[PDB]
Design an enzyme around this catalytic site. Structure first.
Site, PDB file in Angstrom:
ATOM      1  N   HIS A  36     -10.914 -15.803 -21.591  1.00 55.25           N
ATOM      2  CA  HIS A  36      -9.651 -16.325 -21.064  1.00 55.25           C
ATOM      3  C   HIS A  36      -9.835 -16.184 -19.553  1.00 55.25           C
ATOM      4  O   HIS A  36      -9.785 -15.080 -19.006  1.00 55.25           O
ATOM      5  CB  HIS A  36      -8.477 -15.474 -21.553  1.00 55.25           C
ATOM      6  CG  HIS A  36      -8.123 -15.716 -22.988  1.00 55.25           C
ATOM      7  ND1 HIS A  36      -7.744 -14.706 -23.843  1.00 55.25           N
ATOM      8  CD2 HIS A  36      -8.096 -16.855 -23.717  1.00 55.25           C
ATOM      9  CE1 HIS A  36      -7.501 -15.209 -25.039  1.00 55.25           C
ATOM     10  NE2 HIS A  36      -7.707 -16.512 -24.990  1.00 55.25           N
ATOM     11  N   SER A  37     -10.048 -17.310 -18.885  1.00 55.33           N
ATOM     12  CA  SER A  37     -10.338 -17.312 -17.455  1.00 55.33           C
ATOM     13  C   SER A  37      -9.462 -16.541 -16.476  1.00 55.33           C
ATOM     14  O   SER A  37      -9.992 -15.903 -15.566  1.00 55.33           O
ATOM     15  CB  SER A  37     -10.519 -18.759 -16.974  1.00 55.33           C
ATOM     16  OG  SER A  37      -9.501 -19.611 -17.456  1.00 55.33           O
ATOM     17  N   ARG A  38      -8.143 -16.560 -16.657  1.00 53.04           N
ATOM     18  CA  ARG A  38      -7.245 -15.857 -15.732  1.00 53.04           C
ATOM     19  C   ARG A  38      -7.299 -14.331 -15.808  1.00 53.04           C
ATOM     20  O   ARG A  38      -6.763 -13.647 -14.935  1.00 53.04           O
ATOM     21  CB  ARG A  38      -5.797 -16.300 -15.949  1.00 53.04           C
ATOM     22  CG  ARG A  38      -5.209 -15.871 -17.287  1.00 53.04           C
ATOM     23  CD  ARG A  38      -3.785 -16.371 -17.426  1.00 53.04           C
ATOM     24  NE  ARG A  38      -3.194 -16.045 -18.721  1.00 53.04           N
ATOM     25  CZ  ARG A  38      -2.051 -16.566 -19.155  1.00 53.04           C
ATOM     26  NH1 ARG A  38      -1.393 -17.435 -18.398  1.00 53.04           N
ATOM     27  NH2 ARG A  38      -1.564 -16.221 -20.335  1.00 53.04           N
ATOM     28  N   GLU A  39      -7.934 -13.801 -16.846  1.00 59.28           N
ATOM     29  CA  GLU A  39      -8.039 -12.353 -17.027  1.00 59.28           C
ATOM     30  C   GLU A  39      -9.157 -11.771 -16.154  1.00 59.28           C
ATOM     31  O   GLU A  39     -10.107 -11.144 -16.639  1.00 59.28           O
ATOM     32  CB  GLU A  39      -8.245 -12.062 -18.519  1.00 59.28           C
ATOM     33  CG  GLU A  39      -6.959 -12.351 -19.309  1.00 59.28           C
ATOM     34  CD  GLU A  39      -7.150 -12.536 -20.803  1.00 59.28           C
ATOM     35  OE1 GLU A  39      -8.140 -12.037 -21.366  1.00 59.28           O
ATOM     36  OE2 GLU A  39      -6.273 -13.178 -21.424  1.00 59.28           O
ATOM     37  N   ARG A  84      -5.937 -20.382 -18.501  1.00 58.94           N
ATOM     38  CA  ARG A  84      -6.598 -19.507 -19.475  1.00 58.94           C
ATOM     39  C   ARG A  84      -7.535 -20.175 -20.473  1.00 58.94           C
ATOM     40  O   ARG A  84      -8.445 -19.534 -20.997  1.00 58.94           O
ATOM     41  CB  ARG A  84      -5.545 -18.711 -20.255  1.00 58.94           C
ATOM     42  CG  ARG A  84      -4.763 -19.523 -21.277  1.00 58.94           C
ATOM     43  CD  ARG A  84      -3.543 -18.755 -21.785  1.00 58.94           C
ATOM     44  NE  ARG A  84      -3.893 -17.463 -22.372  1.00 58.94           N
ATOM     45  CZ  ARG A  84      -4.258 -17.278 -23.638  1.00 58.94           C
ATOM     46  NH1 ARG A  84      -4.325 -18.304 -24.478  1.00 58.94           N
ATOM     47  NH2 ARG A  84      -4.566 -16.061 -24.066  1.00 58.94           N
ATOM     48  N   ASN A 108     -10.299 -18.236 -27.706  1.00 59.92           N
ATOM     49  CA  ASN A 108     -10.222 -17.109 -28.632  1.00 59.92           C
ATOM     50  C   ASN A 108      -9.339 -17.371 -29.852  1.00 59.92           C
ATOM     51  O   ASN A 108      -8.876 -16.439 -30.512  1.00 59.92           O
ATOM     52  CB  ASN A 108      -9.790 -15.824 -27.927  1.00 59.92           C
ATOM     53  CG  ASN A 108     -10.198 -14.574 -28.709  1.00 59.92           C
ATOM     54  OD1 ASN A 108     -11.287 -14.521 -29.292  1.00 59.92           O
ATOM     55  ND2 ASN A 108      -9.341 -13.566 -28.710  1.00 59.92           N
ATOM     56  N   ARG A 109      -9.110 -18.649 -30.142  1.00 59.05           N
ATOM     57  CA  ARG A 109      -8.348 -19.057 -31.323  1.00 59.05           C
ATOM     58  C   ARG A 109      -9.137 -20.192 -31.964  1.00 59.05           C
ATOM     59  O   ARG A 109      -8.681 -20.843 -32.904  1.00 59.05           O
ATOM     60  CB  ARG A 109      -6.942 -19.535 -30.937  1.00 59.05           C
ATOM     61  CG  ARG A 109      -5.968 -18.401 -30.652  1.00 59.05           C
ATOM     62  CD  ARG A 109      -4.553 -18.920 -30.428  1.00 59.05           C
ATOM     63  NE  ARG A 109      -3.551 -17.872 -30.628  1.00 59.05           N
ATOM     64  CZ  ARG A 109      -3.319 -16.874 -29.783  1.00 59.05           C
ATOM     65  NH1 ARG A 109      -4.013 -16.774 -28.658  1.00 59.05           N
ATOM     66  NH2 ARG A 109      -2.393 -15.967 -30.068  1.00 59.05           N
ATOM     67  N   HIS A 121     -10.558  -8.382 -22.916  1.00 57.46           N
ATOM     68  CA  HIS A 121      -9.466  -9.231 -22.445  1.00 57.46           C
ATOM     69  C   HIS A 121      -8.597  -8.428 -21.487  1.00 57.46           C
ATOM     70  O   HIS A 121      -8.860  -7.253 -21.253  1.00 57.46           O
ATOM     71  CB  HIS A 121      -8.627  -9.682 -23.644  1.00 57.46           C
ATOM     72  CG  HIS A 121      -9.340 -10.638 -24.549  1.00 57.46           C
ATOM     73  ND1 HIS A 121      -9.061 -11.984 -24.572  1.00 57.46           N
ATOM     74  CD2 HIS A 121     -10.353 -10.449 -25.428  1.00 57.46           C
ATOM     75  CE1 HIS A 121      -9.872 -12.588 -25.423  1.00 57.46           C
ATOM     76  NE2 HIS A 121     -10.668 -11.679 -25.955  1.00 57.46           N
ATOM     77  N   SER A 122      -7.548  -9.028 -20.939  1.00 60.04           N
ATOM     78  CA  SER A 122      -6.743  -8.225 -20.039  1.00 60.04           C
ATOM     79  C   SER A 122      -5.252  -8.101 -20.207  1.00 60.04           C
ATOM     80  O   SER A 122      -4.525  -9.040 -20.533  1.00 60.04           O
ATOM     81  CB  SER A 122      -7.021  -8.595 -18.580  1.00 60.04           C
ATOM     82  OG  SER A 122      -6.160  -9.612 -18.124  1.00 60.04           O
ATOM     83  N   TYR A 123      -4.842  -6.862 -19.962  1.00 60.76           N
ATOM     84  CA  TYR A 123      -3.478  -6.406 -19.958  1.00 60.76           C
ATOM     85  C   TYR A 123      -2.632  -6.329 -21.233  1.00 60.76           C
ATOM     86  O   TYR A 123      -2.432  -7.285 -22.006  1.00 60.76           O
ATOM     87  CB  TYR A 123      -2.803  -7.090 -18.754  1.00 60.76           C
ATOM     88  CG  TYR A 123      -1.493  -7.774 -18.928  1.00 60.76           C
ATOM     89  CD1 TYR A 123      -1.387  -9.141 -18.686  1.00 60.76           C
ATOM     90  CD2 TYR A 123      -0.339  -7.059 -19.229  1.00 60.76           C
ATOM     91  CE1 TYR A 123      -0.166  -9.786 -18.729  1.00 60.76           C
ATOM     92  CE2 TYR A 123       0.901  -7.697 -19.279  1.00 60.76           C
ATOM     93  CZ  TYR A 123       0.977  -9.057 -19.025  1.00 60.76           C
ATOM     94  OH  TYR A 123       2.190  -9.701 -19.043  1.00 60.76           O
ATOM     95  N   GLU A 143      -7.848  -4.910 -24.475  1.00 61.22           N
ATOM     96  CA  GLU A 143      -6.903  -5.626 -23.612  1.00 61.22           C
ATOM     97  C   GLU A 143      -6.765  -4.617 -22.478  1.00 61.22           C
ATOM     98  O   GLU A 143      -6.118  -3.582 -22.634  1.00 61.22           O
ATOM     99  CB  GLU A 143      -5.557  -5.843 -24.300  1.00 61.22           C
ATOM    100  CG  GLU A 143      -5.521  -7.016 -25.274  1.00 61.22           C
ATOM    101  CD  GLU A 143      -5.709  -8.369 -24.599  1.00 61.22           C
ATOM    102  OE1 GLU A 143      -5.560  -8.472 -23.354  1.00 61.22           O
ATOM    103  OE2 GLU A 143      -5.997  -9.343 -25.327  1.00 61.22           O
TER     104      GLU A 143
HETATM  105  O1  LIG Z   1      -3.519 -13.416 -28.300  1.00 60.51           O
HETATM  106  C1  LIG Z   1      -4.153 -13.710 -27.264  1.00 60.51           C
HETATM  107  O2  LIG Z   1      -4.458 -14.865 -26.892  1.00 60.51           O
HETATM  108  C2  LIG Z   1      -4.599 -12.558 -26.359  1.00 60.51           C
HETATM  109  C3  LIG Z   1      -4.467 -11.214 -27.082  1.00 60.51           C
HETATM  110  C4  LIG Z   1      -5.480 -11.080 -28.222  1.00 60.51           C
HETATM  111  C5  LIG Z   1      -6.720 -10.500 -27.976  1.00 60.51           C
HETATM  112  C6  LIG Z   1      -7.653 -10.386 -29.001  1.00 60.51           C
HETATM  113  C7  LIG Z   1      -7.347 -10.852 -30.275  1.00 60.51           C
HETATM  114  C8  LIG Z   1      -6.107 -11.430 -30.522  1.00 60.51           C
HETATM  115  C9  LIG Z   1      -5.175 -11.542 -29.497  1.00 60.51           C
HETATM  116  C10 LIG Z   1      -3.739 -12.560 -25.094  1.00 60.51           C
HETATM  117  C11 LIG Z   1      -4.648 -12.419 -23.870  1.00 60.51           C
HETATM  118  O3  LIG Z   1      -5.471 -11.257 -23.997  1.00 60.51           O
HETATM  119  O4  LIG Z   1      -5.485 -13.576 -23.791  1.00 60.51           O
HETATM  120  C12 LIG Z   1      -3.804 -12.329 -22.595  1.00 60.51           C
HETATM  121  N1  LIG Z   1      -3.181 -13.631 -22.316  1.00 60.51           N
HETATM  122  O5  LIG Z   1      -3.877 -14.601 -21.544  1.00 60.51           O
HETATM  123  O6  LIG Z   1      -1.879 -13.920 -22.808  1.00 60.51           O
HETATM  124 ZN   LIG Z   2      -7.499 -12.718 -23.365  1.00 60.05          ZN
END
Ligand SMILES: O=C(O)[C@H](Cc1ccccc1)CC(O)(O)C[N+](=O)[O-]
Ligand SMILES: [Zn+2]
Ligand SMILES: O=C(O)[C@H](Cc1ccccc1)CC(O)(O)C[N+](=O)[O-]
Ligand SMILES: O=C(O)[C@H](Cc1ccccc1)CC(O)(O)C[N+](=O)[O-]
Ligand SMILES: [Zn+2]
Ligand SMILES: [Zn+2]
EC number: 3.4.17.1
Lengths: 307, 307, 307
Positions: free
Chosen positions: A69-72, A127, A144-145, A196-198, A270
């Protein structure tokens, strides 16, 4: 920086600066680190993985991906710090030296390079990837989905314009498929960590299903120990548990896929900040975040080498 | 190829073949084309600029450089096509004829000859020059980060081993200094176009600073008209804007330098493909790319002749 | 005056005299001071900034602008005194020396030169820039309501004829854009101080919104310390607090923009007199005002260097 010793680890960098960092490290530690290109991003940028190995033939390995996720930003910054730390601690720290003497580590600092470039150029909070596909104005997929683990099920969006769009089909994003192909071809990964972040969480398998993994007891304790190790440095508190019971149902996730490939020690971190700054974490927290996170990751690696 | 009429424009060529092409063209169109050597590369190779003129005395001129980044093969190939096109259209096309009746065109097909030879013999993806510094075993400088325009500032690397190394000092690379001396000596250039490859963009002045150029409105209008002309042929979509706002901060750039020299119509084209093939663009796309790009360049020339 | 040592600091000067002063100072202290032209005013006059530095590369910096509102003569006169003061105290006062040994100071004495020239030639009370509006007989924009921070919102006028007209769009005035580009390109400013005249106030971030800044507690205390230092010389009482809660809601202000860029120590000073003389402050008060204001400014710089 003409040396990884002049590189500013306390500041955020661009894609070019990080890619240059990679070559410097390899040049400085040729017998330990190598740069592998596992594919090309949607926009043609090379996708790089740094391989840390002291020899052997496809030794048990540990996978660590950051910046999907680029913004992280804290994650790519932490990945760079991790890279340097490995070269500093090998032959200095008994534990980490033992790990690297028997296992290889594969580190992907910028898993989504097109999005990263975009966060520097047009949108700091972008992201997704930067792929353009069918008859849709919007761009990018939530990489990541996009993994083949409950792909398309609740916990992801089917709207191309959504920030959590899962893509047309599983592994449609080359950034994801490149990892899938590398890991499957390797066949000997024992750990798979996605950074990932936060929110400050350490999560284990299944965000797509409420089903409990066969290794819940062990991964749960590994997570507990990892969070306590991380906390021992600056007191940063992390919560842990399975993805679905800790944050929410999420499908097409990387660790659900890796765990289902038989990679037992699959966890997602995270990183720092619970919302004070969120994705815009101050550069002054890069090193402290990296240091504490390292303790948690090392803890996981240790359980991987002895099990 | 014994004649420019038998030269294969649909395939990629070597330095020797392109240099031979230049002589064939000059021999075939003596009253219109001449070959000028503006210097020698680091490795001693002659640097050639084809001059297209119909007379006059130091008439207002248009500069066009291609191949400053050796691996961007689509540009040298497009450069060759351009040279041929100029000789075919002068006297026939009303607009182009009018342009050459009041202005001269200086075309540098292979701005980085050493790198080009290297892409054919050792490394297809090499982009820098081949200069050998003193205190480093690495080779080459990013010629388009070596210009005296925000030289050494953010947007370039100070590391000799970097792919974006700016070099020892402004104009250190003879491939750049040769252009600088030529253009300064001439003193009457109205347009300066730098052709690069892939991302499909048309950019105007300043990658080294966020300062908007005094002529932003006009160059933006010119860019808009140029991209539409290019698009009209095959539907190829280009984005446009200042270098820094469209891509990212980049220092030591050629058009930032030319614009600062008082050359108002300074633009840089990033040719075909958005990443499918990247730098390895198929030969089957050479002619179509050159054709459409020509329409864009012509559009810029027209705004230069009437203003 | 052929030397800054014979320059009359107790009298008001013209644009030319101040510009000549800059050159004298640079000639006398070449190793510490340099003159930078950051742009050209609407009427083409050079816009100068005096850089005070003892070396380094892009060292953390302190920005100080004066005279953005032309009629506030006490500010430009204070700017001249400031410039001289820095050259006399470096190497003499431990604190100031420490600040310059680790930081750079950029001083813009006449931020609005066209208006300044106008206050000397046509209207002593002119405060805006001298830009000409398309469909209007009125001239100028309130440069301190033209910044991209709540631009166009309550606290400014959209009427060209108004004394508080904000302009066509944020940064429309080159006098403002010139600072924005310089500060943005620099990227390492730690303090941003804007100097104005009369009301005797020291204000911190946000005049456009009642929202409290994240650093309110620290800036408020720094302000309290600064006013105490200032008062300690002649007993001049200053009031402090946020712009909106101290004076009134005002949009498009300089420190609101600078703070939003991440420059923590952003303060605006409204100098001497609470109304007896107003903008027409007697020259006999120039030096005393400058002296006491310096103590307040030095105080802020001290907090900036240690945090
Ligand atoms: O559900 C998401 O897309 C992530 C959190 C996450 C991280 C790992 C596995 C399932 C969910 C949120 C995040 O870490 O990307 C932060 N964000 O950009 O909202
Ligand atoms: Zn992420
Ligand atoms: O930033 C670069 O060096 C160019 C893009 C560019 C082109 C002109 C002015 C500023 C930037 C990229 C390229 O055209 O050289 C392709 N490449 O990455 O080899
Ligand atoms: O609002 C103004 O224009 C300033 C007061 C001010 C100063 C800084 C930030 C917001 C407001 C008044 C002044 O300093 O310009 C004096 N004047 O009325 O010319
Ligand atoms: Zn290029
Ligand atoms: Zn004012």
């Amino acid at each position: 920086a003409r040396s990884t010793n002049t590189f500013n680890y306390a500041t955020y960098h661009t894609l070019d600066e990080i890619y240059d960092f990679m070559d410097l490290l390899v040049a400085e530690h040729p017998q330990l680190v190598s740069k592998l290109q596992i594919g090309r991003s949607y926009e043609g940028r090379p996708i790089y993985v740094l391989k840390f190995s002291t020899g052997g033939s496809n030794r048990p390995a540990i996978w660590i991906d950051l910046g999907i996720h680029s913004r992280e930003w804290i994650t790519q910054a932490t990945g760079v710090w991790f890279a340097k730390k490995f070269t500093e601690d090998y032959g200095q720290d008994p534990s980490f030296t033992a790990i690297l003497d028997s296992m290889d580590i594969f580190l992907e600092i910028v898993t989504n390079p097109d999005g990263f470039a975009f966060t520097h150029s047009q949108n700091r909070l972008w992201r997704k990837t930067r792929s353009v596909t069918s008859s849709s104005l919007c761009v990018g997929v939530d990489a990541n989905r996009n993994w083949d683990a409950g792909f398309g099920k609740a916990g992801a969006s089917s709207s191309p314009c959504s920030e959590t769009y899962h893509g047309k089909y599983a592994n449609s994003e080359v950034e994801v498929k490149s990892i899938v192909d590398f890991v499957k071809d390797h066949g000997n990964f024992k750990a798979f960590l996605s950074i990932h972040s936060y929110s400050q969480l350490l999560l284990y398998p299944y965000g797509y299903t409420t089903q409990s993994i066969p290794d819940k007891t062990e991964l749960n304790q590994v997570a507990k120990s990892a969070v306590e190790a991380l906390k021992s440095l600056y007191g940063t508190s992390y919560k842990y548990g399975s993805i679905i019971t800790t944050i929410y149902q999420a499908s097409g996730g990387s660790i659900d896929w890796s765990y289902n490939q038989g990679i037992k020690y699959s966890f997602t971190f995270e990183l720092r900040d619970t919302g004070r700054y969120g994705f815009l974490l101050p550069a002054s927290q890069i090193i402290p975040t990296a240091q504490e996170t390292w303790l948690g990751v090392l803890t996981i690696m240790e359980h991987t080498v002895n099990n």
